[PDB]
Amino acid sequence: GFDYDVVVVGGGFAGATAARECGLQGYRTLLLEARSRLGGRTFTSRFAGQEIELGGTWVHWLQPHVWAEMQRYGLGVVEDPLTNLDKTLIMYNDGIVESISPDEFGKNIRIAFEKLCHDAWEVFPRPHEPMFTERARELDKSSVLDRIKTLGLSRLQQAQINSYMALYAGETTDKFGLPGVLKLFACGGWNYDAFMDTETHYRIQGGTIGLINAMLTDSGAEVRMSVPVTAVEQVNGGVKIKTDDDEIITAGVVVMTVPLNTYKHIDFTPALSKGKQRFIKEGQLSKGAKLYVHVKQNLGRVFAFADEQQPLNWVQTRDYSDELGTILSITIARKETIDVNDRDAVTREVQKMFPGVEVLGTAAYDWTADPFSLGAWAAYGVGQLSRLKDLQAAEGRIVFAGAETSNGWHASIDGAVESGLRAGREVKQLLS
Amino acid sequence: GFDYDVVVVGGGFAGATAARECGLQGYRTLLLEARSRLGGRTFTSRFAGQEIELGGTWVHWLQPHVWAEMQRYGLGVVEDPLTNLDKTLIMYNDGIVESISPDEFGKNIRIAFEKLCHDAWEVFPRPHEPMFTERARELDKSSVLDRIKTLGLSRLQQAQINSYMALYAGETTDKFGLPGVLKLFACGGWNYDAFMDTETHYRIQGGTIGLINAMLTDSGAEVRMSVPVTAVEQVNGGVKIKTDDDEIITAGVVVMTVPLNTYKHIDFTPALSKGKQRFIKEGQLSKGAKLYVHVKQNLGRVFAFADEQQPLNWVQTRDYSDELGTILSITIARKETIDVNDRDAVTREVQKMFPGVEVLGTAAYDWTADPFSLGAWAAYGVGQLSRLKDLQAAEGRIVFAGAETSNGWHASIDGAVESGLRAGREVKQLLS
Ligand SMILES: Cc1cc2c(cc1C)N(C[C@H](O)[C@H](O)[C@H](O)COP(=O)(O)OP(=O)(O)OC[C@H]1O[C@@H](n3cnc4c(N)ncnc43)[C@H](O)[C@@H]1O)c1[nH]c(=O)[nH]c(=O)c1N2
Ligand SMILES: Cc1cc2c(cc1C)N(C[C@H](O)[C@H](O)[C@H](O)COP(=O)(O)OP(=O)(O)OC[C@H]1O[C@@H](n3cnc4c(N)ncnc43)[C@H](O)[C@@H]1O)c1[nH]c(=O)[nH]c(=O)c1N2
């Protein structure tokens, strides 16, 4: 006789999915969200007359869980201008910006990536079972930089792949675990063209917040915002959940979906397992941020890499026209390379990359400074993928989810949805 | 004031999915199935001590809808012996069986398939929108044989690819539409290795029937078997459904999921649209059947193609050992090349392919003669993909689903699930 059958902590995609699964079973469901908004590491907002995505943005039909949701709710794709590019730039660590023929640019990043992931088929024949092969466990002793060193890439190819990999690590690539990258490549059909198409080409029709809201409406769950959970205690055959103002909610089962790097806000009684405590002490790697920039000039359809010692590591066109000018979408690997909330620094760096432009405005999100993410997309350090099961394991009546805990597209919205479907299955098992 | 909110006609994957979607919304849901069993064009059975799948069998994590279901219900994959093959055979139209080095066999089918589908990226950048490009519509005037003629393949490669394509057509390849094949290739990550991995490598843990049952149990729907629908009439703002014994059930909405080739059993009032009537008169192409064969000898891990003038077009090992012998899984493109229910003919043909073996038993399913399939997997003839929307369109309070009506993996379980998710969404729209 608890207040609720299940309490879901966190209202990003993992928690919204889990609440939808539980609510459709008829369970009395409550979702507690710490921020005063839903979406978590996705955030739909508005800027220079456009809808923008300040966190997770792009999806793909090769991503099975989010795609099945878009099928269920009737959401199409919205194509960003990634094809027929006008300008493809590389900014080297030394600050030189070089314009490359788009054809040659794409050929060289494809060569670099296919070399980096040359053994993906043999190491990850089953990418949703990351430790299926012994070779995957053996490679979890290496970083991505360790492998890049052995490819003997050209200078352009080295700069491109190290930019790409620093972005995916949200860190320098000497800290970035290698098997996680090979696994993502395998999820994308074991080929560079398919994989790249999944990463920054198609957005969700109606936005990430539209899909979140659809699932939560569907769910019937009670949703409370601005309510951080600070303690969880297993007692009386269920759980007591304490919020920051010391109120207590009881439940038969709790689904945790908060980001790994935020677990320090929450006291567990009894303590979690040693393997989980080790993951919580380590956290996940990424220190990224995101920024949109409105410039007066029409730069057309552009793509730019910047290597890891520079701040504007992944640049794409979000919109362009003679009338509007250009909106640039810019993902920053390491918030320590640039204060995305310092407009003067941002204009300096944008002009470094595109000399001549005048900056009409910016919209930024510092995911690393936000207390309820404390980092960006999930990025595993060396040796962490090998221990993933420690983070996935249930502990009594507490179920764990979130993209960090997924097997497949762990750096994506899809991995969050996957973990939420798993969580709902586990709740059903616990309430049988 | 109808008997039910929605009646789902058909208990294969499309109907079970649609009923699950409707039941979880709380709609009063009934499913009518014509056979005395569920599963439709999947059928889990038993043979020589093993569980076998006499219809749809293999699935993949690149197939988004069925994979999301497996995630929801906790179903793993079961690997059949497709790697590290002992024997790879090609049987030519002239009846010669030739054993090919497995490495060479695989390289040659890969070359043939990558040439056949060379423009898949450009024609099907968005495989779930099959008519997105003008080139796709233009190509829908050509058959697969038209393209094979222009590739100038070697004799081995031509025989391999024509066997593969006759199987997918369930017909000779001069009748097989080309764009549907390019689209399937695109769904599979635009590359042969990924694509081939999706088609006959992994089975559903617990069987197709286990997933069907999980969805229907979840649904809460009322399920009736051995009850064929023979007429549907839209009247009084809903629908009157008549069964073969002239009983009448009323509903707000009906979801049709029966195979295209069986629509001749059902009278619609008012008549369906001309575009639908044209599809129903044409039907879909496939005339296939399936057979398992138990032989005394241990043949190990085998794969064989037979070209379209021969009957045992796709052969794989389902199980092998010295103790038990071998179980061969055999898919037949055209039931007119062999009477799979004629054990003597079956033994003759198996021995033609593997001379010397003793045939201990068989289990077969003639999908083409069965009145509630009248064919096997969905296979489009020339010009049909272009008109797919005619088949997909709702007609008043009648919703249409089934694998033939899906946009993506139309020849698969996945396409059926996809269409059932679409149907649930459309029912929700109609009942608002
Ligand atoms: C800048 C950037 C860019 C990208 C991406 C991320 C980011 C940050 N990703 C990844 C994607 O955004 C991410 O994997 C998912 O949104 C994670 O969803 P979860 O639900 O796991 O965590 P998420 O962090 O969304 O949800 C956790 C929730 O818990 C809440 N919370 C934390 N502590 C709490 C407490 N104590 N009590 C209560 N609530 C608490 C938080 O407020 C948050 O709402 C991405 N993906 C993709 O598919 N495509 C892309 O292009 C990108 N790009
Ligand atoms: C031999 C063989 C082999 C394969 C495959 C098929 C076959 C036949 N496929 C394809 C796959 O099996 C298929 O696409 C789906 O099962 C189709 O599901 P649907 O629900 O669309 O039709 P399905 O035909 O399953 O369901 C329709 C239902 O309607 C019923 N019905 C018909 N008329 C009726 C009436 N008047 N009233 C009531 N009910 C009526 C039928 O009895 C049937 O149950 C496959 N796929 C895959 O993913 N992997 C594979 O390996 C294969 N291989």
Author numbering:
A (entry chain B), B (entry chain A): 51 to 482
Authors' account:
Nicotine oxidoreductase (NicA2) is a flavin-dependent enzyme that catalyzes the degradation of nicotine into the non-psychoactive metabolite N-methylmyosmine (NMM). NicA2 acts by degrading nicotine in the bloodstream before it reaches the brain. Clinical use of NicA2 is limited by its poor catalytic activity in the absence of its natural electron acceptor CycN. The higher in vivo activity of NicA2 is due to the presence of a cytochrome c, termed CycN, that acts as an alternative electron acceptor to O29.
